[PDB]
């Protein structure tokens, strides 16, 4: 459950990301492919080379979806509805993988937000990423 304080922390941190959201999105994916190579099994159709347009483009789509969820943090289920269906019925990514991407997004934010990444914000972002992951896997079965 995100407390009001959590929502405030997320909004503040994400706000700082600002215009770099897609570039951060791309970096988090590269960090995941390198650290957790089993996640590559879901991208056999992609050029996974560093800076590939496919990864940059996907990074942007992931960032925008996170922006959408931050914007509608009080109603995530409705906000990510479409994405929830896609992942449940077409992509069918094992739920374990969401935890790995979340970790890599946290590391990316840490690496880029020296001032904002306090212990309390880190806690709030971790919870937020867990919630998004839960909404995305909620229609699996």
């Amino acid at each position: 459950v995100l407390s009001p304080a959590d929502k405030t922390n997320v909004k503040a941190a994400w706000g700082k990301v600002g215009a770099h959201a897609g570039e951060y999105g791309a970096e988090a994916l590269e960090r995941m492919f390198l650290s957790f190579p089993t996640t590559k099994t879901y991208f056999p159709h992609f050029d996974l080379s560093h800076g590939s347009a496919q990864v940059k483009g996907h990074g942007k789509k992931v960032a925008d979806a996170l922006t959408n969820a931050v914007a509608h943090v009080d109603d995530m289920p409705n906000a990510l509805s479409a994405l929830s269906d896609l992942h449940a019925h077409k992509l069918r990514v094992d739920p374990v993988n969401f935890k790995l991407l979340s970790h890599c997004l946290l590391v990316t934010l840490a690496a880029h937000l020296p001032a904002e990444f306090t212990p309390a914000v880190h806690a709030s972002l971790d919870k937020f990423l867990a919630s998004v992951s839960t909404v995305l896997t909620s229609k699996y079965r």
């Binding site: 099994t41 879901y42 069918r92 094992d94 374990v96 993988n97 079965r141």
Partner: protein, 146 residues
């Protein structure tokens, strides 16, 4: 893997009573029913729409038999699971693109099926020995991922 003599004999003794064809079909069918996202690897298998459809699908039963037959082979080489499964490990990574978490789910479904099939004979200590084996097998199959 590291099995005490008692764990080895428990494993071996039960496996002599397993009809691999039958258990294989049940295990794979239950995986597809209980964790439906696993169906993503079997688009060409036909109808997987209902539990009944999944369970009586002949391509499911056939594949189930192949998988458990290979699994049976590793029971024979418990001391060298990685070496036994290396080729299949590379196949599943490079050609099939199967997330190894699927090996873990199958391991758990298999345990459930042995318990269902054997009842009271599948005691806590027997299960514990099987849990080490399925973890070993999953680890052996994920070994060559890169």
């Amino acid at each position: 893997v590291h099995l005490t003599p008692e764990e080895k004999s428990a494993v071996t003794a039960l496996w002599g009573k397993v009809n691999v064809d039958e258990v294989g079909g049940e295990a794979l069918g239950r995986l597809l029913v209980v964790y439906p996202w696993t169906q993503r690897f079997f688009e060409s298998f036909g109808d997987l729409s209902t539990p009944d459809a999944v369970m009586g699908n002949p391509k499911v039963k056939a594949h189930g038999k192949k998988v458990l037959g290979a699994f049976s082979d590793g029971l024979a080489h418990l001391d060298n699971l990685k070496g036994t499964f290396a080729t299949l490990s590379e196949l599943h990574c490079d050609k099939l693109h199967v997330d190894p978490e699927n090996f873990r789910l199958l391991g758990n479904v298999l345990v459930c099926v042995l318990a269902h099939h054997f009842g009271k004979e599948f005691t806590p200590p027997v299960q514990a020995a099987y849990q080490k084996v399925v973890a070993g097998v999953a680890n052996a199959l994920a070994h060559k991922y890169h």
